[PDB]
Amino acid sequence: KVFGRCELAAAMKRHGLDNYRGYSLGNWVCAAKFESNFNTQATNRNTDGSTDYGILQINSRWWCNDGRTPGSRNLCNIPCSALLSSDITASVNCAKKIVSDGNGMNAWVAWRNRCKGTDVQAWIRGCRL
Ligand SMILES: [Rh+]
Ligand SMILES: [Rh+]
Ligand SMILES: [Rh+]
Ligand SMILES: [Rh+]
């Protein structure tokens, strides 16, 4: 599924991401924009042989099992394919564990390089929330 900006903002807010560990909803929408362009089906291969899955590009190195990432963890206890669903529940609940892991949203290299220190509020401008 390809979400609208305000549609994803609304689903992320319903799932408790607005100010989760102090990250305003605009941070999460910005992250999803540069990770997946709001596409739940987005997949991208990493140099280490792991793969990033779904609207928040959650990696198989630590967070999910894709059956092909040797010496990896499954800390969200999910198949990586669950991160590709039209239902973002699994991505959101996994994201909450990731952001809690010690490095906050710096876990998302695209957040650090494209969202951190910017006017992230712009990402939810005009939405009914
Ligand atoms: Rh939902
Ligand atoms: Rh808020
Ligand atoms: Rh709010
Ligand atoms: Rh509201």
Q: Decide if 18 contacts 10 (C-beta within 8 A).
A: no
3-state SS class at 65: strand
Residue 8 CA to residue 34 CA, distance in Å, equals 14
Q: Which secondary structure element, helix H or strand E, spans residue 59, and what is its range?
A: strand 58-59
Resolution (A): 1.9
Helices (H), 1-129: 5-14, 25-36, 89-99, 109-114
66 known member of a binding site: no
10 Å Cβ neighbour count for 7?
Answer: 13
Known catalytic residues?
Answer: 35, 52
Q: How far is the CA of 6 from the centre of ligand 2 (A)?
A: 14
Split into its structural domains, the chain has a count of: 1
Ligand closest to 91 (CA) is 1
> Ligand 2 mean position to 126 CA, how many Å?
14
Print the domain residue range for 41.
1-129
Burial group, residue 88, by CB count within 10 angstroms (0-12, 13-18, 19+): buried
Helices 25-36 + 5-14 axis angle, to 10: 130
The CATH code of the domain that includes 76 is 1.10.530.10
Give yes or no for a contact between 102 and 113, defined as CB atoms under 8 angstroms apart. no
Supply 73's token pair.
């963890």
Angle subtended at Cα 60 by Cα 55 and Cα 63, rounded to the nearest 5 degrees: 80
Q: Which residue type is seen at 80?
A: C
Q: How many other CB atoms sit within 10 Å of the CB of residue 53?
A: 29
72 C-alpha to center of ligand 2: Å? 35
